[PDB]
Amino acid sequence: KVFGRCELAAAMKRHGLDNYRGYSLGNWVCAAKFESNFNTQATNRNTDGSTDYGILQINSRWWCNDGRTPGSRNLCNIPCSALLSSDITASVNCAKKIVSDGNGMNAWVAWRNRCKGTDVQAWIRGCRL
C-alpha cells in the first residue's frame, strides 16, 4: 500500500507515535517519506547482505528475521515480511523499540540527513488530526 501523507499521520497518531520519546508526529512522517516514499512494500538491500523492510525501512541485521541474514538478530521478534503489510502496526511497534534504544531517530539515516533540524511540522500541516 502507498499511503497518503495525512492518511499515514492519522494511522501513526492512532498507534501512539505523536511525541513518542519526544519526537513530534511530523518527524515520523518525514522519516517515512524519505525512507520508503510511503510504500509499505519497499525493500532495499544493504552492502553487508542485510535488507531494509517496510515503510520505515527496518533492518534485518537486528530487528527482524528474513532468513537470509546470517549472524543477525530478531529483536522485534517478527518475520521481516510482516513489516510489508498494509497494516503498519508491526512496523510502528518495532519502531518504538528502535527509537528507545539510545540513539533516538538517528537510527534512520534519511531522518538524520533530511528531517533533523528542518520544519518537520510542515509534514502534518493541513491534516485533520
Ligand SMILES: [Cl-]
Ligand atoms: Cl510535528
Ligand SMILES: [Cl-]
Ligand atoms: Cl536470518
Ligand SMILES: [Cl-]
Ligand atoms: Cl532522543
Ligand code: NA
Ligand atoms: Na535478523
